[PDB]
From a paper:
We found two Aβ40 filaments (types IIIa and [name]) that differ from those previously reported in sporadic AD and two types of Aβ42 filaments (I and II) identical to those found in sporadic and familial AD. Tau filaments (paired helical filaments and straight filaments) were identical to those in AD, supporting the notion of a common mechanism through which amyloids trigger aggregation of tau.
Type [name] Aβ40 filaments have a width of 12–16 nm and are composed of four protofilaments organized as a dimer of dimers (interface 2), with each dimer similar to the type IIIa Aβ40 filaments. In the two inner protomers of type [name] Aβ40 filaments, the density at the N-terminal region was resolved due to inter-protofilament interactions, allowing us to model residues Asp1 to Val40. The outermost protomers of type [name] Aβ40 filaments are composed of five β-strands while the inner protomers are composed of four β-strands. At interface 2 of the type [name] Aβ40 filaments, the two dimers interact through their extended N-terminal region through a hydrogen bond between Glu3 and His14. This extra density, probably a charged host factor, interacts with both the disordered Asp1 and Lys16.
Numbering used by the authors:
A (entry chain K), B (entry chain O), C (entry chain S), D (entry chain G), E (entry chain C), P (entry chain Q), ...: 8 to 40
F (entry chain P), G (entry chain T), H (entry chain L), I (entry chain H), J (entry chain D), K (entry chain R), ...: 1 to 40
The structure:
């Protein structure tokens, strides 16, 4: 049905990625990968 | 049905990406990849 | 049905991307990739 | 049905990733990978 | 049915990952990998 | 006086291929009958 | 006086291919009968 | 006077392949009949 | 005067392959009939 | 004057393969009929 | 529909030859540095 | 549909030859540094 | 549909030869440094 | 559909040969440094 | 569908040969440093 | 020095000759080939 | 020094000759081949 | 020194010769092959 | 020194010869092969 | 020194010869092979 999301604070740095066959996520809320 | 999202603060830096066969995400809310 | 999204603040920097066969996203809300 | 998520604070740094055949996540809430 | 998650604070650093055939997660709440 | 070779090339030939595909969703990567070297 | 070679090229030939595709969604990458080297 | 070789190339040939696919969801990587070397 | 070789290449040939796939969910990696070397 | 070889390559051939797959969930890794060397 | 080949021909190349002859009597046949196929 | 080959030909190459001959009497046949196939 | 081959041909190459001959009487046949196949 | 081969051919290569001959009388047959197959 | 082979051919290579001959009388047959198969 | 030859009677027939690297002779008297 | 030859009678027939690396002779008197 | 040869009668027939690396002779008198 | 040869009568037939590395002779008188 | 040879009568037939590395002779008188 749905999402209620708030007041999230994120900082990030990503170094080299070869092959992302999937999920590289800071915060993942109910997603499908 | 739906999303209610707010007051999110994000800063990010991404280094080299080779092949992104997927999701590289700061915050992912209910998405499909 | 729908989205209600607000007061989001984002800053980002992306370095070289080879092949983006997917999603490179700061914030993704309910999208399909 | 759904998610109620809030006041989350995240900082992260990722070093080189070879092949992400899966999930590399700071916080994962109810997602499917 | 759903998730109620809040006031989480996370900091992390990831070194090189070869092949992530699975889950490398700081906090995982009810996800499926 | 010496011989130096890099023969890192390739050859493909006598092949018979039938490739049939039904509905495809996001094709994030590849569906390949036969792949000979290369990078997706 | 010496010979130097880089033969990193390619050859493809006697082939018979039938490729049939049904509905395709976003094709983010490739659907290839036969791929010989190269980069998608 | 010496011979030096790097023959890290490849050859593929007498093959008969039938590849049939039904509905595919996100193809994050690859579905390959035959893969000969290479990188997905 | 000496011979030096790196023959780290490859050959594939007399093959008969039938590959049939039913519904596929996220293909995070690969479904391969035959894989000969390479990296997914 | 000496001979030096690295033959860490490969050969695959007379094969007959039938590969059939039913519904696949997240394929985190691989389903392979035959894998000859390589890395998933 | 079929391929038919007779490749009974020839190739000769990177060669360095020094040929010196002193008095020759009846040369009934041949004095050859290098002979590649053929008939005397 | 079938492949038919007769490759009864030949190749000769990286060679260094020094051939020196002193007085020769009737040469009934041959004096050859190197003979590769053929008929005298 | 079948493959048929007669590869009864030949290859010769990295060679270094020094051939020196002193007085030769009737050469009824042959004096050969190296003979590779063939008929005298 | 079947493979048929006659590979009754030959290969010769990395060789270093020094051949020196003193007076030769009737050479009824052959004096050969190295003979690889063939008929005198 | 079956494989049939006659590989009755030959290979010769890394060799170092010094052949020196003094006076030869009728050479009815052969003087050979190295003989690999064949018929005199 | 010399030859004294007489009253010789010869009849001959020769079939195909491939390569005559030598002597094919009915009567040879003191010759050099 | 020499030859004294006489009253010789010869008839001959030769079939195919491949390679005559030598002497094929009816009568050979003191010759060199 | 020499030869004194006489009243010789010869008839011959030769079939196929492959390689004559030598002497095929009806009568050979003091020759060198 | 020499030869004195006479009143010789010869008839012969030769079948196929492969390689004559030597002497095939009806009558050989003092020859060298 | 020499030969005195006479009144010799010879008839012969030779079948296939493979490799004559030697002497095949009807009558051999003082020869060298």
């Amino acid at each position: 049905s749905g999402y209620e999301v708030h007041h999230q604070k994120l900082v990030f740095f990503a170094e080299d990625v070869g092959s992302n066959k999937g999920a590289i996520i800071g915060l993942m809320v109910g997603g499908v990968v």
